[PDB]
Design a protein around this ligand. Structure first.
Ligand SMILES: [Cl-]
Ligand SMILES: [Cl-]
Ligand SMILES: [Mg+2]
Length: 223
């Protein structure tokens, strides 16, 4: 077939969020003069993933996710913390990290010439615009669809409906979504009636395609 419209997730799809996060956590903890252990990093990631999942399922706001993750983590290690203040510091550090996924720039640069590209993301709009710009990816996308502007969030069908209504001459059948989240991107997109491409470099709901490297999309899209 011949897709015309490509919906990209941002974090761990085209930008290396793991890298950004690793640095921002270190800088947050340095700032707070709190030792950051490998165990603490592992617990952060379970806590953070659990909060985001709760948000995705509609049990929590995104503000709560971001403003309680650090207070919840530190509580388990004997520190009482202002979650909101720590998130403000963290956010400032995170926005400086604009590390790319291997081959992302080249890929997006080439695909822009033959497809219409859109961003679909639940991340903080200020954060996503800055990193997309600093990485060089920004100019290639026709529109940016952030959860915070919609009243909903990936994977919710109402988020994808908001997106579809706002893409001119939208055709589900000629639309591919590319993303790393099996639940947010792949299951969201499939339920919303779209083909899906699961970005899964670490080889962890059946997608139309599953890839290890962004460069595999050249073959999938026949170009
Ligand atoms: Cl997202
Ligand atoms: Cl975040
Ligand atoms: Mg992602």
């Amino acid at each position: 077939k011949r897709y015309r419209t490509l919906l990209f997730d941002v974090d761990d799809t085209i930008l290396d969020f793991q890298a950004a996060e690793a640095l921002a956590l270190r800088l947050l903890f340095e700032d707070q003069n709190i030792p950051l252990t490998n165990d603490m990093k592992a617990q952060y990631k379970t806590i953070n993933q659990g909060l985001w999942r709760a948000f995705e399922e509609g049990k929590m706001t995104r503000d709560e996710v971001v403003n309680t993750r650090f207070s919840a983590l530190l509580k388990e290690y004997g520190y009482e913390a202002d979650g909101a203040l720590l998130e403000q510091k963290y956010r400032r550090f995170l926005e400086e990290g604009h590390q790319l996924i291997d081959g992302a720039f080249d890929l997006i640069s080439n695909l822009q010439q033959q497809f219409d590209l859109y961003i679909v993301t639940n991340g903080v709009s200020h954060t996503q615009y800055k990193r997309l710009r600093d990485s060089g990816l920004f100019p290639f996308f026709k529109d940016i669809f952030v959860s915070e502007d919609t009243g909903f969030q990936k994977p919710m069908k109402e988020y994808f409906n908001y997106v579809f209504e706002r893409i001119p001459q939208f055709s589900a059948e000629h639309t591919l979504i590319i993303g790393d989240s099996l639940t947010a991107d792949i299951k969201g997109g499939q339920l919303a009636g779209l083909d899906t491409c699961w970005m899964n470099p670490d080889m962890k709901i059946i997608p139309t395609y599953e890839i290890r490297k962004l460069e595999e999309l050249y073959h999938i899209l026949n170009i």
